[PDB]
């Protein structure tokens, strides 16, 4: 029905919006088992009257594992969870520009090999 | 000294490390007026006993307008500041794998027609 | 009549002495409006038993604009004023050499790349 | 660390880091007696409103003697110290150029015949 | 960037400086995973008003073990940690030479057959 | 009886064991004053069920002065003491392996111009 797509490069992952207010809405991978399927979480509130709008994203990439093929019955399970939340904050009145730039910003600020770098390999950003 | 650049097409605007604390660490473009200057926050903790490791990213962007040639005898002032925090957290065993798919998921789920959508018009995700 | 002359690179800024009290001169750079002109206002006191002097250097440049030309009936007034005061504490029987090493060091240490970008962009003295 | 080198003349003394609060830092010169060594305190405060800005240095230097050569069971002590202060107070909403300018004078204010004559000799600023 | 080396005979191993207060540094040796990654830290403060200076060194050699190798899913993890830390205490007047003795012997108090044996071995001192 | 020696390039001081309890055992170099005489307080104890064993080491330099020279009729007094302990901290089962290396480690360690240098100059690590 209503989904989201994202390319890893060659791959491609697409999520379904399983639950939904419009409130908040919440999207999952089904595909591997019911667990772990990489999870999504949207959100929208409005802080004070009129001040501003707050959006939220969570996002739980969950590592599982199956080992039902090589210890006698137990099954898959969670080694953890990784995650990457955002808490963007805009203003009512901002300029349909303002708001653009922030956008660009981040996009591209995100995908610089110093970020990444960081992120996996724990490298202070900076150079 | 140490820096970060930033692609808004053709346009490119670089950020400076002014200082470097414990957990602390900030980035600015100095330049332009001194209070209308875009901050980036960037910190580094680890709760626990070494158990997990949070990063921490605030983005912050204050639309600042100067009315000197307007009216004469007037100087820069800020009308409101927009943000963008990301709250990622990693396990301190992770596979350089999970951690490098987790950045390449956000970086491309940004780069989203959709995401850009919903930050710019506030349009729910969903296709 | 008591002058003195600074070289702003190129340029040769002149301050003159505008009044003499017993303990404290006074200069204001004789030019441009008669109500925002450079300030400079040089104390000098002895500490109780003649232990010690303490110098005091004070210095006041107003950012001034003249609206005569674009608003009818406006006259030059002060936007702001931006202030360097200086505490020098000698004692009395200080070696001769004690006393200039001091100067000197204050000297390079402002011509300093970090105190200037500290000073003009607010950058922290890391490096 | 974070350090800073100044010129004096020929030789160059270095200023290492000794501590860091979220105002203010703090230099001392490492080498000689660990008695009386250079020293330098940067703070950083805010005003009111967030009207101005106000920085603070302090430098102070000690005289010490080493009298282990002719007095037997004497050790290095301090004389004296002798200091000197800033205290810039800097607008916000300030020019760029109308900042520098304001660096610029004082530095080429300090490197002053008339200025050293004074600090040194206590020569008032006539001429 | 700030580094630290040692050499165990042969082999080498690097430190690099990982977090930073003037007040007290950390070094890590970013090369196995994340965990267990060889740690060691600094520090420094001031008993009392100038009548001392204590410095401390801990160095934490956990001993780490992957075996997704050969059992089903299970990461690399840490089995215990040795430690090693020092406390040394300098008085803030002494002699130049006064320290020099006690690093020279400590020095070679380490590198004593006698010291290894003792702690890898657990056998008596004194021989 | 059973003794220490220490090389300082070619000056050899001795130590002497003149105690030795249950969980204490002390050395020191007898000649000389009384007071002024190098102590080497050893220890090893093992909190809870043999879980862990912790070690021990205490290093006492006193500076005396004898005036005997200067002042007839006088005798040698204590100016000050500076120390240097350790606490090692070992896991019942590691590994000779584990055990060994650490020790190795420290050795080259302390002999470094880094740690030199900070101990007597007090200059923070890493190059």
Do not use: M
């Not at 039902?68 to 955002?86: A, D, F, I, M, N």
């Amino acid at each position: 029905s209503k989904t989201i797509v994202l390319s890893v490069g060659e791959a491609t992952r697409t999520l379904t919006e399983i639950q939904s207010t419009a409130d908040r809405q919440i999207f999952e991978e089904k595909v591997g088992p019911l667990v772990g399927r990489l999870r999504l979480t949207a959100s929208l509130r409005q802080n004070g009257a009129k001040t501003a709008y707050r959006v939220n994203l969570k996002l739980d990439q969950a590592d599982v594992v199956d080992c039902s093929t090589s210890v006698c019955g137990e099954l898959p399970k969670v080694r953890y969870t990784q995650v990457w939340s955002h808490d963007v904050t805009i203003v009512a009145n901002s300029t349909e520009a303002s708001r653009k730039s922030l956008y660009d910003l981040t996009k591209s600020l995100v995908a610089t090999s110093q970020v990444e770098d960081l992120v996996v390999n724990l490298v202070p950003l900076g150079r």
